[PDB]
Amino acid sequence: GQYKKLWYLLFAVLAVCFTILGYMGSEVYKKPYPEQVVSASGKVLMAKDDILAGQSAWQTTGGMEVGSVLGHGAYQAPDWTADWLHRELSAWLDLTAQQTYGKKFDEVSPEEQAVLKTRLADEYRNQSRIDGSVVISDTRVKAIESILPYYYGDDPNTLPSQEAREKLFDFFFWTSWSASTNRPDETFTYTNNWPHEPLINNVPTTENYMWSFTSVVLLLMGIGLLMWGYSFLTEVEVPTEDPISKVQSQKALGKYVFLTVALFVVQVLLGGLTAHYTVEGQGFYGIDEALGFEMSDWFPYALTRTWHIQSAIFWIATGFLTAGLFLAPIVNGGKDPKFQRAGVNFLYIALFIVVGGSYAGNFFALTHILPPEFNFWFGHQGYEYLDLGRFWQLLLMVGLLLWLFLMLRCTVSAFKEKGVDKNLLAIFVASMVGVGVFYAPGLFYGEKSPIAVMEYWRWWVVHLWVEGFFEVFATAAFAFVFYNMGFVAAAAIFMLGGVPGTLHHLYFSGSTSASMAIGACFSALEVVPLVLLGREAYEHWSYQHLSEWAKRLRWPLMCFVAVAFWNMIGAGVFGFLINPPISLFYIQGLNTSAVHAHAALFGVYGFLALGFVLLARYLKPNVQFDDKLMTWGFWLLNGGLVGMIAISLLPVGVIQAYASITHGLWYARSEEFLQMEILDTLRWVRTAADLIFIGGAICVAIQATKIVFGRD
Ligand code: HEM
Numbered sequence: 001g002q003y004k005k006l007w008y009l010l011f012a013v014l015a016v017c018f019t020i021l022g023y024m025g026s027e028v029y030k031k032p033y034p035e036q037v038v039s040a041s042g043k044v045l046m047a048k049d050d051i052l053a054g055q056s057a058w059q060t061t062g063g064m065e066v067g068s069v070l071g072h073g074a075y076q077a078p079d080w081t082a083d084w085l086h087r088e089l090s091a092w093l094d095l096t097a098q099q100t101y102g103k104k105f106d107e108v109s110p111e112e113q114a115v116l117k118t119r120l121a122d123e124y125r126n127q128s129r130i131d132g133s134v135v136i137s138d139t140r141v142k143a144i145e146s147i148l149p150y151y152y153g154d155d156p157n158t159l160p161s162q163e164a165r166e167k168l169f170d171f172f173f174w175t176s177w178s179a180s181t182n183r184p185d186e187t188f189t190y191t192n193n194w195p196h197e198p199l200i201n202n203v204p205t206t207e208n209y210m211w212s213f214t215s216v217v218l219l220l221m222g223i224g225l226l227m228w229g230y231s232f233l234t235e236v237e238v239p240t241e242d243p244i245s246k247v248q249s250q251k252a253l254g255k256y257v258f259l260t261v262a263l264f265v266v267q268v269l270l271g272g273l274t275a276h277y278t279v280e281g282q283g284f285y286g287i288d289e290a291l292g293f294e295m296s297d298w299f300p301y302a303l304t305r306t307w308h309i310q311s312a313i314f315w316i317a318t319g320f321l322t323a324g325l326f327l328a329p330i331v332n333g334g335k336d337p338k339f340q341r342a343g344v345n346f347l348y349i350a351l352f353i354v355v356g357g358s359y360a361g362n363f364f365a366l367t368h369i370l371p372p373e374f375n376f377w378f379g380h381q382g383y384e385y386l387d388l389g390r391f392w393q394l395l396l397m398v399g400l401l402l403w404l405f406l407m408l409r410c411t412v413s414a415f416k417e418k419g420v421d422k423n424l425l426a427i428f429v430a431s432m433v434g435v436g437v438f439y440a441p442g443l444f445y446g447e448k449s450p451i452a453v454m455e456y457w458r459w460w461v462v463h464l465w466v467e468g469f470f471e472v473f474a475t476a477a478f479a480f481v482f483y484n485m486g487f488v489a490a491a492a493i494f495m496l497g498g499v500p501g502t503l504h505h506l507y508f509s510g511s512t513s514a515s516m517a518i519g520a521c522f523s524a525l526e527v528v529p530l531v532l533l534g535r536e537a538y539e540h541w542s543y544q545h546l547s548e549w550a551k552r553l554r555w556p557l558m559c560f561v562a563v564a565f566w567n568m569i570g571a572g573v574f575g576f577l578i579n580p581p582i583s584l585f586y587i588q589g590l591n592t593s594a595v596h597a598h599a600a601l602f603g604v605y606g607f608l609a610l611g612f613v614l615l616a617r618y619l620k621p622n623v624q625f626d627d628k629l630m631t632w633g634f635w636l637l638n639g640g641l642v643g644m645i646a647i648s649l650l651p652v653g654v655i656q657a658y659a660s661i662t663h664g665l666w667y668a669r670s671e672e673f674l675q676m677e678i679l680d681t682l683r684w685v686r687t688a689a690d691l692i693f694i695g696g697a698i699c700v701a702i703q704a705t706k707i708v709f710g711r712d
């Protein structure tokens, strides 16, 4: 502890962000599942048993990777919490159709519809829950009896006194009731008025459009303070004074990248088959005819959706762990422990079986060829990005512990070398610890558990362990590599902004006001680091006239300019578009967020993983590596990306947003809406950009494939 204040710099922001996220985490752990709901007379229709068994069955079926609830999943099949609330609203429109109005929704004229939607609105929004029991009217009993026949188009001894399937729809009805009931002390719902159901009065409250602009005010405060702080005005070379970049376990690391790019290509095959599944889900041009039945049984949309997301995970994950363990032998200085290649291959094949087995379990449970107890563990887990079973999550994190074991083994010498408590060999070994550990948050998670805590612990990995990795490990690797070649804060600001801001997805899943405010504030503060690359991009544009024949690093800068470009675009200006509750209320679970997904995953981290696979370059000479396939890959991947985020997702997304604004979210998700001429033909011409993007993935894939003929 020579200069422990520099440790206290990170310790402070980390302790305050872990206090904020941990205690607002205690707030979303505290602030339900009624033991048994009853009728006005007495009879039961649902129990905690049925809601949690229907949750377990929901997680068995894997409906979260095909039909969204609370906005959190896939966007092919309609939202089974908005659609349920609308179908139950149609049930209340069918029920009271006796006295002061006609039969249908719009059969009664707007003049007399004024006396209609007041009675039901003041039926269930009044607190109807004590004793773990929800008490409901015989009206609501006949409603919950009325709604079930609706649940086609093109969308996927004695003990109890209910069915099993019944438990699923009881869990759906639970999501509906929990979504459409006011809080204690407050006049808004547990979901903060979600979903957008107009006829029950569900729209953002005061805090939403207060903090929506307070976030803008805080962001402009930050921008202003830095920009006016920049007034005082407080290089490794002059014009032409750069040195040459030359240095000569990694036999097996060459296969990690082949795995990586093959998984990237099949990830885009599942992306493309998910693309075709959103055009026609009744057949496949002969082989899957309604008489025949071939493709729809074995490899459905659920499977393409889970496997597209598990491939995106695994190809980028191997795409960075390969770089971690490829740059490992430079950290200690070649200091190889006993049987290191064998351990790296052990880890490699553990990754292989985790990868295969995980989405093979999804194969088995998503087609339901599996018991109840055997789902979740082996089968589909039921959650976006944790689609992989728990067996395989535990095994993946054991792969992360063998990786952190091997990386810590490959930095024991670096840990012995550093006398300074906050050295590069302390930050780049804090980052690897921050990676190899923080997938563990994802395991504090069970099928029979409450869902708020579950998703809290989900975005605790999917927007925390992803963000405290590519902006922390990759950057201390950047410093390390640019130090070792002779070329030469973000972590602290991005883990002060990003760690407590990760709650920006959790506004409409049971969060208190403090969590909304914190989320809003710190998600607003997530922009000011990502916008710093807005000048760094221009600086690059006015610095990239340097490398010639001798300089090996030519095209990776053309990767990284795009990385910074899309890192300004996809998250900074596209994430803060959706950050406000006023827009996220409606946007939550539309094609709008596919733009942010494809543009912030492949747009930022995909090209980064590709750049790190290309960092290939220390096994081939400077003037012998071929680079037409590089430009091919760039033009095709970026043209396909900008194509798929411009031609399709922007217009469909904004159309969907306007439809959600006007007719309602449930309508914006309904098949009557989602099968318009415009939208069907737009989803039909989405595949052009997909062809080009797959072409681009194939180009850079065949580059790294054909790298293997003449290597160093
Ligand atoms: C040719 C390549 C690709 C095609 C054709 C493709 C196509 C698709 C399609 C059609 C969807 C369905 C969206 C929906 O209706 O819900 C999807 C979802 C998704 N894709 Fe891709 N994709 C490709 C590559 C990628 C890559 C390389 C990444 C990331 C590295 C990526 C990340 C995602 C994510 C995250 C989602 C889901 C978003 C969510 O569930 O909320 N895709 N993809």
Ligand code: HEM
Binding pocket: 071, 072, 073, 384, 466, 504, 505, 523, 524, 526, 527, 530, 570, 571, 572, 573, 574, 575, 576, 577, 578, 579, 580, 584, 587, 588, 589, 590, 593, 596, 597, 600, 601, 604
């Ligand atoms: C590299 C950085 C980032 C990545 C990889 C990323 C990734 C993602 C992904 C995949 C989703 C889709 C979740 C789902 O549909 O279930 C998402 C949602 C979202 N992200 Fe990000 N994000 C990043 C940065 C940001 C930033 C900086 C902001 C705000 C300034 C932001 C705001 C949002 C919002 C508001 C949503 C909600 C969309 C929805 O639930 O449908 N993100 N993010």
Ligand SMILES: [Ca+2]
Binding pocket: 071, 072, 073, 074, 384
């Ligand atoms: Ca999603």
Ligand SMILES: [Fe+3]
Binding pocket: 463, 502, 504, 505
């Ligand atoms: Fe996020």
